[PDB]
Amino acid sequence: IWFSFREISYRHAWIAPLMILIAVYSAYFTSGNTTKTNVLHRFVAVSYQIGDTNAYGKGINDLCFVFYYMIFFTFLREFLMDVVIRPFAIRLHVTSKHRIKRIMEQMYAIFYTGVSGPFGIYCMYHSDLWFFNTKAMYRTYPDFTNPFLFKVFYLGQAAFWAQQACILVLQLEKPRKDHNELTFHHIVTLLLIWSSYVFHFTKMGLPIYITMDVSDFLLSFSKTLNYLDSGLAFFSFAIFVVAWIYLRHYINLKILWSVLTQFRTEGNYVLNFATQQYKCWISLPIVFVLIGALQLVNLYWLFLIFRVLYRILWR
């Protein structure tokens, strides 16, 4: 039956990750201690809850969590992609190869991105950061402790983008298309997530993808309605372009400016290795450079957006 199981794993792509994670979950949820005294708990949940409150520390169990949810997010992508997005590519009349491949990719982008957008907005809502407050970013800097939703948001993003980057370097098929911009995006996103979490620049991390996720939701919606020829596509693309101009430019420029000005002015700005607070004049370069890298990528992308916009406007 091993050969038949391999055959079904060749006709699908989610059977093996599904088995791995269902085995882990079933073994963990077999009665016992569903608490911090279990290896499967370090692999299934965020650990290091300080005392009995809404504060969470860091550790190696964080890496265990991240890798287990890479394993999980492979299963989410394969299952959704095939089982759902091929029926939505066939039950609606679409006739091409690149058209159907990219229509699957864009609707999966719509799915995960519209899941991660509102969750980021909610996480920023019940916090002192509400509507991108640039002073709560630096008020209480060292932030060794993160809330439950906020920590799980950070580690889910890490698992998702790490899985993207590893299937980017394990070339199964589809050799080369956009992979220069794509690899720059994946490497920069993964480095920013890791370095933002490790070095406690964490409340700084929430507002920046909030923008990336909701803007990507709008962009992928516009491209999906392009594929599925509807005539409402240009309306969605205009909404997308105004939302892109607002979020990815105005909010990130405000955040950069926030770095430059209120990184010094607000909170603690005397380096102290004992206290483990790195917010000083040595890390301001690094933070500004990472934000600048993201902004350069988004600048090239709106050059592309507006090039397409005017060509279609007079075409």
Binding site: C166, V169, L170, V270, A274
Partner: protein, 133 residues
Amino acid sequence: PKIFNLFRVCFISLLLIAAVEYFKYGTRINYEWFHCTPIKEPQSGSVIKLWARGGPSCDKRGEYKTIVKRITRDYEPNDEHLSFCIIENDNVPPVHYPIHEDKGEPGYVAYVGYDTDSELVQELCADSTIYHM
């Protein structure tokens, strides 16, 4: 499916993760090499006076750490046995240094010398306990 390319990329990513975590840990446990700079004040034949001066991250234990490491790895006792005294400045709060260069009295001063001149250490260390080594 070029597995090995993945494997090397992931193995170097974990290597950066471990390297930066060691950076954090090491710079925490022995931070006094970063914030505190130890001052040696020459004296008569074989004795010197120790202390440290840094910013507000050079607290009292930064000074104690750097003073004791200077004392213990600037003097070889296998050649000749030494003798030292540590005197604390009892009216200066633990965290007491200004960012600027008008810092003032240190938290700790220590006198250390060899046993050729141990009465000299007796003289410089007034009535504080005198540690042999």
